[PDB]
Amino acid sequence: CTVGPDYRTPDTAAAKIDATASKPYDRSRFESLWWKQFDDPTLNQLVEQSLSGNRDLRVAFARLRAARALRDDVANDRFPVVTSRASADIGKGQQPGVTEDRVNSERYDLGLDSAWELDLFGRIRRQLESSDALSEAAEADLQQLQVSLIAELVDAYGQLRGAQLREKIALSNLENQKESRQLTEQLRDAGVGAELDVLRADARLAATAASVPQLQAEAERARHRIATLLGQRPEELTVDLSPRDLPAITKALPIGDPGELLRRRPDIRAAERRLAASTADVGVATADLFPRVSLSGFLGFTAGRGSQIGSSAARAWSVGPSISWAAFDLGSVRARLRGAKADADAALASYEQQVLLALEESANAFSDYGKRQERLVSLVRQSEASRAAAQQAAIRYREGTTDFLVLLDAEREQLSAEDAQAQAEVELYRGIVAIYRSLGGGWQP
Amino acid sequence: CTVGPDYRTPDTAAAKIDATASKPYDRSRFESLWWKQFDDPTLNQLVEQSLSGNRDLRVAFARLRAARALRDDVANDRFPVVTSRASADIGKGQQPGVTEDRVNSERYDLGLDSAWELDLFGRIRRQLESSDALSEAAEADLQQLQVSLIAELVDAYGQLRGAQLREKIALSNLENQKESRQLTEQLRDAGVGAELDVLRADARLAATAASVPQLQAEAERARHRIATLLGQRPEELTVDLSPRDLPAITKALPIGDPGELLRRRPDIRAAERRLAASTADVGVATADLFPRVSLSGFLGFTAGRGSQIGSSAARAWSVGPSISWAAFDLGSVRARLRGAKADADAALASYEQQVLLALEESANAFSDYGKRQERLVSLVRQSEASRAAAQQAAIRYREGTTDFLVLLDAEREQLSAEDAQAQAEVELYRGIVAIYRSLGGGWQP
Amino acid sequence: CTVGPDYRTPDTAAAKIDATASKPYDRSRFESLWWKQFDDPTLNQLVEQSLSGNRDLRVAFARLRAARALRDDVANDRFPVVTSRASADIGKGQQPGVTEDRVNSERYDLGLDSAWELDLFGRIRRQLESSDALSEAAEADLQQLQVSLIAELVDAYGQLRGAQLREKIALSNLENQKESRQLTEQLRDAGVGAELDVLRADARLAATAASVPQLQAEAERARHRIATLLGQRPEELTVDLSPRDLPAITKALPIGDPGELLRRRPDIRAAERRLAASTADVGVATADLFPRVSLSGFLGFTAGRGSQIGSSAARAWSVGPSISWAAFDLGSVRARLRGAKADADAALASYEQQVLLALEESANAFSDYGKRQERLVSLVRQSEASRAAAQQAAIRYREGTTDFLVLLDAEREQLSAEDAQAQAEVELYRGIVAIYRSLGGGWQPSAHHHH
Ligand SMILES: CCCCCCCCO[C@@H]1O[C@H](CO)[C@@H](O)[C@H](O)[C@H]1O
Ligand SMILES: CCCCCCCCO[C@@H]1O[C@H](CO)[C@@H](O)[C@H](O)[C@H]1O
Ligand SMILES: CCCCCCCCO[C@@H]1O[C@H](CO)[C@@H](O)[C@H](O)[C@H]1O
Ligand SMILES: CCCCCCCCO[C@@H]1O[C@H](CO)[C@@H](O)[C@H](O)[C@H]1O
Ligand SMILES: *C(=O)CCCCCCCCCCCCCCC
Ligand SMILES: *C(=O)CCCCCCCCCCCCCCC
Ligand SMILES: *C(=O)CCCCCCCCCCCCCCC
Ligand SMILES: *C(=O)CCCCCCCCCCCCCCC
Ligand SMILES: *C(=O)CCCCCCCCCCCCCCC
Ligand code: NA
Ligand code: NI
Ligand SMILES: [Xe]
Ligand SMILES: [Xe]
Ligand SMILES: [Xe]
Ligand SMILES: [Xe]
Ligand SMILES: [Xe]
Ligand SMILES: [Xe]
Ligand SMILES: [Xe]
Ligand SMILES: [Xe]
Ligand SMILES: [Xe]
Ligand SMILES: [Xe]
Ligand SMILES: [Xe]
Ligand SMILES: [Xe]
Ligand SMILES: [Xe]
Ligand SMILES: [Xe]
Ligand SMILES: [Xe]
Ligand SMILES: [Xe]
Ligand SMILES: [Xe]
């Protein structure tokens, strides 16, 4: 007999995300190794190294091992606990009721001690049920950490490429600006220009030059995040992170059925497991409303004289059946039961919150990614127009048919447009990461 | 007697906030349902729904129940703990003292077991005092969560309106810029224009177009945050969140006496409660320096033969008065007492820190709100001048009395001014939230 | 005898930071009171007030005392625990074995009760070894908090000066802009200007005016962070924070040998101590594979009649030697051992992660600081050219040889350049803080014979 509530997984409705029945997405398959679709061998090597080197991941494997070991101890409580012991009780004094003389008093015991709770109401079955569930929670915590780590690492590689891309855009615009500064000097020196043109050109050149070490600095913080995520020291990175293009995915994104997301996400499973364990804990406490039946035992040797221990004349056995019940202390048992009920309500609510946070993450990731595609189309147009404008403004300044401010302003806009477009490409890549993170991709799924 | 210190709430001086004798503020009343002053029924519905749906709030209620359950168990220790038992000791072997033959031996007991610590030094009174205080702390944690949740939600609604406001500003500027692009093409096509004007107009149009999906993306993240704060899935959100104006409060802000803030804030009460509990815990530990006086009992039946249990010939009673005192183990008792004293100093320091954090939050909220009002006055002036400038620049460009860059730049400034003004209005709304959060507004007892 | 693994500090290689062999840095000495290099008495007073008033620091000191007190209780388990008792047993009923009559029964005891676990396999020595290490971890947590707090406070002072600097730049640019607005009005009113010029001038003035209360607002948030970090209420600040220059260090930075950073960082020591404690806990669990030997005792008086307690005829004593061993419960003991092994692997990995996070912080702080110096050189050039451009554009606008946009744009760029430069100066100062934070500056490593 196993008292208290029988846990049932909640009847959690599947995710509905309408925005996913469109062209950017392929619901017909899900790609578990979602980062491989970027077709970037360097990224793939980063991820592989991270799975064997990351120290947080190592901690989580260890915690999983700890939880199994806890469970394994609790499972032995289903059986009698048979220990060994050699003891004595030696003294001199009165023996009240028997005599008022001070007599010597000796007793020796050697053998097996047995302690056994008969699990008639399932206190122990429930403890094991809880511990098994906490083991499964720990496995899910590990899987979630893997999902989180892969996403963080892929994202950081993106940021690194972004900084590299933007540095290259900044240096390229710096050269255009150097050419222009040089033209303002030439015109001024030939008597058909102005110091005012050279000054403004210098100021703009220095502004653009100032962005370079900023961008390099962000690249270096990203390289350094990557090294830690790999379990590697900053100066000991194995993998060559020299500049390459920001990866892209041109096929529609294999996102599977978004209805499956709540079943795929390990954080959801972890919190469901904790709910199951907490529900079993109600059982544990509920069992204390009923009597506790135990059976102690001794098998070995008992004697008044040490010499006899081990011999036939000292053979002994004893059996200690016991039934106890809280009786007038039932109020206390009820208080602990209320406590366990409260903890299980906490766990339920906490599970529900994770479900909601997960649906929120996915809804954001999909809404973002679609908008980021739209935005990019406009930014690409801005860049094209800007490049063309600055080209023409350069020709006109050179020829004497437009003021320097026209060229200055067109150059500012070209840089500003090309930079924003790159940032937006990085955003798109990061949005891909957020989608897969939110779907629970990357643990074996 | 009740040993150890008698807790007294610290004499914490009232908050002094001088900036509040200004006319932005009404110290003559405080409005508990502070969000209702925005006169936004949609906001009011959100708040009411969140109080019944939010899952973090559910967790906190459950933790409150857990703490009451702990307290209820402790309270029973003021009374004797009277449990029930049926036991036996059955076996064969020597009986030291009595005989060296291996004899059969039986003993049966059935009745009530009684255990009572008498509480002469108040160890138990103090345990209960601590537990009651931790219950009040848990109630205050819940109330603080209510304050935090309401503030987060109101703030998020503000962000949502902000994104919607800014989208509308971006679309309105997009129309002006579309008209301009069209004018540059027209003038070019009519032989009094230039390709360079069309290109720059295209670039600027695309830039403005690009901002729209960004702002929509932010609107969607805010919609989704609102749904979770309500305890709802994103696609189930009941409330119509289609655009409306960012709410405003035109009367002076009813902020009450700022010297009441520390009494109103539940976080301060929670930390004060934990301090009270920790002070009682010093009492608990201090009691262990004194003797512990207890009284055990048995009432029921005892017999050498199973047959007799229940009969008057097996009636039994016993009574076990006992006094113990740590004696040579006083060093251990002292170490635990030092430990409890240390924990109480931690709690005191931690209470003081919450006081300081609260005064910091308050002082920031008031400093900010005044500055945000000032800043807005300038931004409103900037917007007006900018719109006028761009209107006139458009007239002049069309007429042939100013270059396109003059119109371009005036259009950029109009958008930049109108968007900054909107952001600043959002800031002002959020400043209102920060004031009320910091004053401890919005909780139920 | 002491059982289970004998802890050894891991053989952690020294930090390698190559970028530190260059001339921004002086590796020949380290300054532990690293903020004093700024030669700012106001900053020095803030830091001193913080060390005596900050409440987080007080919390952490208290937690350190709690952990020592826990350890002191555990230490007494190496010795017999000798308590005292006065008790009685009174009742009426059968005495199984002896009689089936219901007899009256009385008994009185007064004396010393003794309990002693003899630490033959070191279960207790190991518990103490763990507890001592957890105390050292708490000491190191406190020291790390001190490092973090000092850094936070110095950083905040920098942000405060930054806000004050930028306000001053904004007001100064506001004055230039007022002069220009006045010129647009004059030219318009004298028949050779344009309303369009006055309107754009007005818009820009309002933009610049709008920045002032924002910057003042940041100054006030900073003042308030500083007050809490000092343990002070916002309106009760002891130190005068009225505007002064952002401090600067002209000497190359005394950063010592970066290969001594992992030894100096308290967070690294804290994690190493938790590793040591965890390793000792393996010992504790390993001891349960062996027998446990105990010895109980009683010495005092026992009697059937209350009157006799205290007299020679009621003298009593007993001794309770005992040895137990898990026997068929060894699988449970093994499960606990595997558990403790798992926790020690967790702790090792956690120690290693802290090492890596520390190397990452250090490497970022040095990469940043170098880059921030370079960036500043360019921003200074931008400011100079911009100031000059705006002067010339003003001359040309006055002449009737440009539209006002030329002057407007030059003025925007001047403000934008001077503001960016100031932010970048603040960045450099904050990068100094990040270096010292990451090196473990601001606590006293050689205090307490070190260990
Ligand atoms: C008056 C004389 C009485 C004689 C009684 C027999 C003595 C018991 O002596 C016993 O001998 C064993 C080996 O033989 C040992 O293993 C036991 O531990 C020992 O105590
Ligand atoms: C208060 C915690 C630290 C004090 C350590 C010394 C013991 C203090 O114990 C004191 O002695 C008396 C006992 O009857 C009582 O009257 C006091 O109220 C009690 O607290
Ligand atoms: C009333 C009968 C009890 C016998 C005397 C009690 C001994 C109390 O003595 C205690 O021993 C502690 C640790 O060993 C010492 O540190 C304390 O100074 C002392 O309080
Ligand atoms: C683990 C050894 C027991 C140590 C108790 C030592 C108490 C002193 O702790 C000290 O406090 C200061 C701030 O409060 C820190 O700067 C010191 O570095 C720290 O050692
Ligand atoms: C809920 O109360 C269920 C109680 C179940 C008791 C189960 C006992 C199983 C042992 C079966 C052995 C049969 C003969 C073998 C003798 C050792
Ligand atoms: C759970 O208790 C519900 C009641 C119905 C289940 C029946 C199980 C019968 C068990 C009898 C146990 C007595 C054993 C005592 C040995 C010392
Ligand atoms: C100091 O001397 C304390 C004063 C209070 C009396 C102390 C004795 C125990 C009080 C517990 C209250 C309920 C006990 C009822 C017994 C059935
Ligand atoms: C391992 O088997 C332990 C052997 C137990 C023998 C008893 C030792 C008597 C105590 C010596 C005192 C030394 C003090 C050092 C304190 C760290
Ligand atoms: C310290 O002195 C080392 C003692 C040497 C060991 C012998 C003690 C016998 C007790 C039985 C322990 C069995 C361990 C089982 C593990 C697989
Ligand atoms: Na109780
Ligand atoms: Ni020390
Ligand atoms: Xe044994
Ligand atoms: Xe330029
Ligand atoms: Xe930088
Ligand atoms: Xe047994
Ligand atoms: Xe411009
Ligand atoms: Xe019972
Ligand atoms: Xe019984
Ligand atoms: Xe029994
Ligand atoms: Xe809420
Ligand atoms: Xe435009
Ligand atoms: Xe976007
Ligand atoms: Xe005593
Ligand atoms: Xe500090
Ligand atoms: Xe201006
Ligand atoms: Xe502001
Ligand atoms: Xe700050
Ligand atoms: Xe012993």
Author numbering:
A (entry chain A), B (entry chain B): 1 to 445
C (entry chain C): 1 to 451
Manuscript text:
To gain more information regarding the dynamics of the OMF tunnelling mechanism, we focused our interest on OprN, the OMF protein associated with the MexEF complex within P. aeruginosa. This efflux pump is implicated in the resistance to fluoroquinolones, the most used antibiotic class. As a representative member of the OMF family, OprN structure shows two main domains: a channel of 100 Å long located in the periplasm, also known as the α-domain, and a β-barrel of 30 Å long inserted in the outer membrane. The protein channel is closed by a lid of three β-turns at the extracellular side and occluded by a constriction of three a-coiled-coils at the periplasmic side, which gating mechanism is probably ruled by an iris-like movement.
